[PDB]
Amino acid sequence: MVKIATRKYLGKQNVYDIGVERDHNFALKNGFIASACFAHPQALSYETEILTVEYGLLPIGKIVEKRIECTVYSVDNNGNIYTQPVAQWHDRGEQEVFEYCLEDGSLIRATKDHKFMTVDGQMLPIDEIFERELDLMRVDNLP
């Protein structure tokens, strides 16, 4: 239940995504739920931290550059949390990145199409979440 306070364009920066085999989402630092759909430019800045079972928070750019085998947290269509392994690692090259600062102080640096889960359980582009002043889903349950 966290709105996005501000949006800032950072320019073109290297971005990254991962693929999973079950529900196409995974949890970031603080419990926000990013889409893992096969979608472009959708991708995340190097620093964006993914919660992994094995290592805790790791930057996605490190996970991708080193092809780290690890297990992420995901949400099913009934809202239950489960874990599943990373199945794909992609360096997506330079893309336009926007920095979204959230009302809880969190920062998300993503291509502005990147879908994230809102509190109703739906996936929307982060830029639309910002413009329409919607609340991001934040899973507080995670270890």
Q: Which residues contact Ca ion by CB under 5 A?
A: 17, 42-43
Work out whether 132 is an interface residue with a second copy (CB under 8 A): no
Which of 63, 55, 52, 82 shows the shortest CA–CA distance to 15? 63
| Cα distance between residue 79 and residue 115, in whole Å | 17
**Alpha-carbon Rg of the chain, whole angstroms?**
14
Question: Taking CB under 8 A as the criterion, which residues in 8-67 touch a second copy?
Answer: 21-22, 24, 35, 37-40, 42
Which of 18, 33, 29, 44 shows the shortest CA–CA distance to 96? 44
From residue 84 to residue 113, the character string flagging contacts with a second copy as x (rule: CB under 8 A) and all else as - is -----------------------------x
With contact defined as beta carbons under 8 Å apart, do 60 and 48 qualify?
A: yes
17 labeled binding residue: yes
DSSP state for residue 75 in the 8-state scheme: E
Report what 22 binds from Co ion, a second copy, Ca ion, none; CB cut-off 5-8 Å by kind. Answer: a second copy
With contact defined as beta carbons under 8 Å apart, do 43 and 36 qualify?
A: no
Work out whether 142 is an interface residue with a second copy (CB under 8 A): no
What DSSP letter does each residue of 88-118 carry, written as one string?
Answer: EEEEEEEEEEEEEEETTS-EEEE-TT-EEEB
Minimum Å gap between C-beta 113 and a second copy is 7
Report what 17 binds from a second copy, Co ion, Ca ion, none; CB cut-off 5-8 Å by kind. Answer: Ca ion
CB nearer to Ca ion: give 17 or 72. Answer: 17
CB nearer to Co ion: give 99 or 128. Answer: 128
Binding residues vs a second copy (CB under 8 A)? 21-22, 24, 35, 37-40, 42, 77, 113, 115, 123
